[PDB]
From a paper:
To obtain higher-resolution insights into IpCa binding, we collected a larger dataset for RyR1with IpCa in the presence of a cocktail of activators, including 30 μM free Ca2+, 5 mM caffeine, and 8 mM adenosine triphosphate (ATP). The presence of IpCa on the fourfold symmetry axis results in a break of the fourfold symmetry, and we therefore processed all data without any symmetry imposed. In the global refined structure, the largest movement of S6ext is also observed for chain A (~4.2 Å). As this movement is primarily a tilt, movements far away from the hinge point are larger in magnitude.
Ryanodine Receptors (RyR) are intracellular ion channels that control release of Ca2+ from the endoplasmic and sarcoplasmic reticulum. RyRs form massive (~2.2 MDa) channels that are embedded within the membranes of the endoplasmic or sarcoplasmic reticulum (SR), where they control the release of Ca2+. They form homotetrameric assemblies, with the bulk of the protein exposed in the cytosol. Calcins are a family of scorpion-derived peptides that can penetrate cell membranes and bind to Ryanodine Receptors (RyRs) with high affinity and specificity. Upon engaging the RyR, calcins cause long-lived subconductance states, which are readily detected in single-channel recordings as decreased current levels at 20 to 60% of the full conductance.
Residue numbers in the entry:
A (entry chain D): 3634 to 3681, 3693 to 3736, 3750 to 3862, 3871 to 3972
B (entry chain E): 1 to 106
C (entry chain F): 1 to 56, 63 to 129, 135 to 148
D (entry chain D): 1648 to 1749, 1759 to 1787, 1796 to 1873, 1924 to 2014, 2020 to 2046, 2091 to 2216, 2222 to 2261, 2267 to 2369, ...
E (entry chain D): 244 to 318, 337 to 361, 371 to 426, 436 to 455, 465 to 499, 506 to 630
The structure:
Amino acid sequence: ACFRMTPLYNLPTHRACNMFLESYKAAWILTEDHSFEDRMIDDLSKAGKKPDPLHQLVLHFSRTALTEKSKLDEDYLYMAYADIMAKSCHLEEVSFEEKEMEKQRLLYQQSRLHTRGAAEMVLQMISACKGETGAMVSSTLKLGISILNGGNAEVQQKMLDYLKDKKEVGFFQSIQALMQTCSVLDLNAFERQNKAEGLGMVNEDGEKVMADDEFTQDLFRFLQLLCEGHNNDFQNYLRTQTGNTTTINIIICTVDYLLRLQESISDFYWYYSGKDVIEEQGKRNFSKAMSVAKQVFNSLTEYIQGP
Amino acid sequence: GVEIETISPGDGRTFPKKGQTCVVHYTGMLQNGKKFDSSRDRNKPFKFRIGKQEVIKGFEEGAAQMSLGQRAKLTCTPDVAYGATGHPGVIPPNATLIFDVELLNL
Amino acid sequence: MADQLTEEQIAEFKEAFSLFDKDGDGTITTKALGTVMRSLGQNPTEAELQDMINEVTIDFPAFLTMMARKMKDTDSEEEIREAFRVFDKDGNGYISAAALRHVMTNLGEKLTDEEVDEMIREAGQVNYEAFVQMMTA
Amino acid sequence: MDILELSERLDLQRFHSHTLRLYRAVCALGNNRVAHALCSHVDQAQLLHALEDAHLPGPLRAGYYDLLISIHLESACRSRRSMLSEYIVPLTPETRAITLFPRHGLPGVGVTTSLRPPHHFSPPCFVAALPARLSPAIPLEALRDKALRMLGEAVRDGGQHARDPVGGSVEFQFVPVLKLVSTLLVMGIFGDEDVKQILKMIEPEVFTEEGLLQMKLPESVKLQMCNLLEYFCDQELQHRVESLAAFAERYVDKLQANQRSRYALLMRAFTMSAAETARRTREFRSPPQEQINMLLHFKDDCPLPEDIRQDLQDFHQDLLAHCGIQLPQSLQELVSHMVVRWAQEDYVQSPELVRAMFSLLHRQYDGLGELLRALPRAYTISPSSVEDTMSLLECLGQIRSLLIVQMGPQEENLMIQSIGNIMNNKVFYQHPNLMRALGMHETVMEVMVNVLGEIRFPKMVTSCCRFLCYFCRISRQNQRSMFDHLSYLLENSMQGSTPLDVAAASVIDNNELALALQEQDLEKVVSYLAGCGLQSCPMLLAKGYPDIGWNPCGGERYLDFLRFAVFVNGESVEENANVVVRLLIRKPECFGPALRGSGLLAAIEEAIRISEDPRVHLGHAIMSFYAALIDLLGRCAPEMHLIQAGKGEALRIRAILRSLVPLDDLVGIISLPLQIPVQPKMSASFVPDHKASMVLFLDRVYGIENQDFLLHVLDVGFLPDMRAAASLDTEMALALNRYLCLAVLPLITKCAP
Amino acid sequence: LVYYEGGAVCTHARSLWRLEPLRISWSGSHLRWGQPLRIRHVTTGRYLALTEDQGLVVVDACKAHTKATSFCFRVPEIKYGESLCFVQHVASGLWLTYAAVLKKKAILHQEGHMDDALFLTRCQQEESQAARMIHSTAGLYNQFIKGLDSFSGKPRLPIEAVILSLQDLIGYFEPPQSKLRSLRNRQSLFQEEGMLSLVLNCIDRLNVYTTYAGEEAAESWKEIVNLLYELLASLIRGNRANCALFSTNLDWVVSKLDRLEASSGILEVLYCVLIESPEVLNIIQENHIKSIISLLDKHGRNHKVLDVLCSLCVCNGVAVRSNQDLITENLLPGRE
């Protein structure tokens, strides 16, 4: 039926304009690059007692998340600001002087975005997430990995202080239920994807499996960064919640997730054992699972790093 | 019937009963005298159609009875104007629909 | 329903239905609808009209869906004719392996070499009858 | 008693303010009759006098100003705000020549291509013959002029910084006026000159051709100013959309001409072999989206003119300059400086004000990002169907307003009439893009959720289900969107159309949706099938008939949905068929009462007995349910290629489904004759579709391979059916012929060797 | 009757129990395995005893014999009772177990069950003090209601004590942010124990009499009624259960508000429960708006009634046609 397809030059004008506009937007706006994020964070950070505009925004979001609404709104402006800042501090051969200067600049950018209370907003939002996966959790995890980049000791210390003062069991249960429901490799899903690919994308004018692979990668990166720096006190707090009424052992649940990942990858290999040639989709799935396992193992190292 | 009491006498030869739309400064008075509706309150004279029966039967009869160019107290019984119920909020039940419609033009 | 139907045909059918049924509820009977369609230049077959009446107080979108289902055979015939014309566009009305690969590349489906070889074997160069059989599929 | 004299009474003023609040609440959220009653009570002149009087009490003046827009233009402003999301830009010769740059242009100036429905105002009347209702009329131009004069007076007073504020406070002096002017601004009351004057009053130095923003304002006035700035940003976005639509029309015309010339040249040229294939790659053989993408691949080798590519690059650079991403005269710079100064001045204790201010700032700097987000919500309508699109927008706004108001009696009829008008609207089925962008599916889903929460308004549910099913039949993208929300339809889902029918319509007519079915849906349907046992159909319960241990109606509907899910485009998905048969057999209760006890022939005999015993007959429903069950069992059978390949799972499934139902029972069921003729009623008897389903089950499960078996199955059932068809060669005759041609003929052709 | 149940029961005051050692002196010493002790309910005040007829159930304090109420834990050795502590009666030796919204009745058996071990969770001292105060207030209210029924049928009571208890309860439930959460938790605990039902019964008993007791004794009856209405208003605020109960009993609330005496308190309670529970407006009938309209005509012009009408006009973010039409057809046509 391709030879019988309607030509572009013989078509209703309005449909042609709409299609061309959509194609232009997809090919230019998405590819278009704006670095205004650093521009805005610093300009609004000029601050030229009386809290800074960043401090006011952080306090407002902390108050919003502190409410026991048991639900998360769209918060489009929150997405915008989280993307702005997370990318801000993410502004991140070379001699020792250059590396030291880069580290000092990163530390300054973090402290500019940390003393206002970003760690408190991270903890409150994660606790209020109630283990519900979504764009809220991804945005707050990106903001956390931005604030916690480089293994900052002050951020970890303030997070520990907030956890001790609040003594709220919601954060541990929320994170446990959140990472427990992370998707793993499914052979039924992989077969469905293969059949869909064989159907043909051109027919009737990404992948369900490993849809949240980047989500789990970022979550385990944040968890590793939390365990970064050989902070023995934070490791003890994560192992047992002595201060909290209920203690959630993150080690057992992350080991269970590792078991699930190993079962999924073993089943994938068993399915692919018959075919010597590895398909492109299968190779991509294997690479994504390999990256996820690498991030998980690095997180485990950071749990076990130090005596 | 419809009580007629002149207030501003004018021309009597002209009659709006021909069957054409007429612009009148129609105003309404409640049983106790409250001005529930007035053309001056609306800041625009009301256009009334004769024959089309767009307005209430009692109001239309009162407007047609008064000759063009003269103003009279066209008091109408609530039974023929709006009935016992009347307007849901404007006219209380069992309230007389007293009118003081004044003929202006057409 | 009528996703693949032409916009002009859909507009003409909507105008005809509105003219036939002013209420907009589609109360026009099947026989009356067929007579109106015949008067509009699209004469309906008596057997097809009887089958549609037996299969079927229905709104215009239902009538459009029924018409699209009835004309799906006509769309398939038109597609087969277009495929036959495309096959005849090659040398002597026969599409070779290179011609089949070029057609597949033009279509944008990005058919693999194995698929092209299988199509050639089903249709070394294919003949006019083989090309017609491949187009019919 | 003068209203002004009640300011210091401290009791009469409070009572009047409470009365104003009660009137506003009564007139809030539509309620046009109550709005007209409130206008009659206020006589439509007291509010104007209070607005024009600067000596009125603060709270009283604020209440009168709020009522001026809450009882007159509240519905119009709400409709305008609802319709602002849809940036529909129909083609027009005046709109064909639109440029973003006239320096930056003033926001909210020039002709707008947005097809927002016009506001309809009805002149108030209290003398007409009283037997929904339109909004009461407003002065419009006179009200706009009065609001502009009040805003100018407030600006002058703020500049003078007099110690005698209007209403006794700055909040009463400025906030109600700002709210009123914003309300008439979102309604489009003011023209170009009036909005230019308003912008000059707000900031004279910024928009060259002190200000209100420069002068200190309270938190509420700051929030109102931020809302005005947000409206200005929205107007700028609308201007950008209009310019984009004009450039799109021009560039589409140019590309149509260039493509026609290129196709003519390619047809003329024959010597080139590889170049011919390269041209055919971007020719009509590829889908139009692929051709458009290929023609737009020259960003940053495609067969496109160099001059038009340079023109498009210059246009894109102009767009980037207009958005000001990278180069207080500029509007975006002005609002950015304003919000920065407001944040740095002091701590603001109003979370809403700071949230709205931050929204505007990110909004202002990221012009391109907003354009990308608003890019899907943009479409060009045909110039001929402008009235149809306007009617579409008006009806959609009516449905949105009905959804905003609480559902109740005498209100579902208006929504049903609206739905009928949408169905009869040409653009609803002609262009699915407006249907998707306008959120009509979202609105109908919301009202269905509201009504369902016992079906209080069954007619409303039936109309909503019919509209949703029609929407899925409109196009495949609508079907995919319904799939994205399919979980609610399966979770929530008597008589007439049901949301589960909408789900079935979403599944059918596409293999992509059928293959991607999630196991949760199959589990829910299997649980529903299990729950169908030990129950009765609501129609049977109403009729008073004794329960037969299952409900044929709901069970048959669910089974038909399952057969739609498994059977698409003739073929059956192996994974879906395997999982559905596994979940079906795992719970034996979902099968018929005979299967576990009794047999299929015993069930057929019992159904015939009930048919003989005294269009809601139980026997016909039981026979239809059994036929659907056997047809579904035979539908998920592995195809011929799977059997030939000898797959272990396929062979096991085929053996299980073959042993589940013996062939002899099927032959006995088919052997039952029909009363071919006066002709009987098929709605209360054995329809030939049951025999067709049985024959299809036999063909897909057992298959007549041996000559003796084929002769036996032709003699039993097939021969009496053929004899009855020949004798009656009428609805019964047509049904028999359809059954023969759909089941007997393909099987006879297959078994011909 | 002793019965183990889960869910919100664990968070209620009815699940609070106190263990008292056999020796009155040094009752605060550390508990040891096998040490006899008496279990008394904080909310009910009845010490648990192993009665022969009732098995393991709460018994009256006067009849709480030492032998019947002697209980001990069988494995300064355990921490807060988290370790396995099998409940055994000292005199009988039977092991406490269960026999049959899960809820299993608790009884005493010679053999018991292998899963009879239970874990005890420590409770805050503030919660125990609040439970004790609630029990004392409930007892005082029961005594007052008993006296009211006593003198109700005889034409010619600790009024001061009742007034003091009402004032103390109002101060406890005085609105002040964890203060709002604490007030809501206290209101929920009071409603679970039946304080709201007792308050409603006392209000009804007071409304029965239109003026009995002595001339001086009945002088403070109006003050007692006002204090009870204030307590009901305080309990209604920040309590979903109280709002739901008032919505269920909306007709009685409207009838009470229709009374001339202490109409302001009942009107405030109705407004508070309507704000807390938007479903009250939907379930409201025309009699409520009729009474609201007549309140201004009879009692006089008041902003509270008009605010209640405003709340009735729009609730839950939507406009209800029934109440809007009632308000537009009740007082608007009259214009008085």
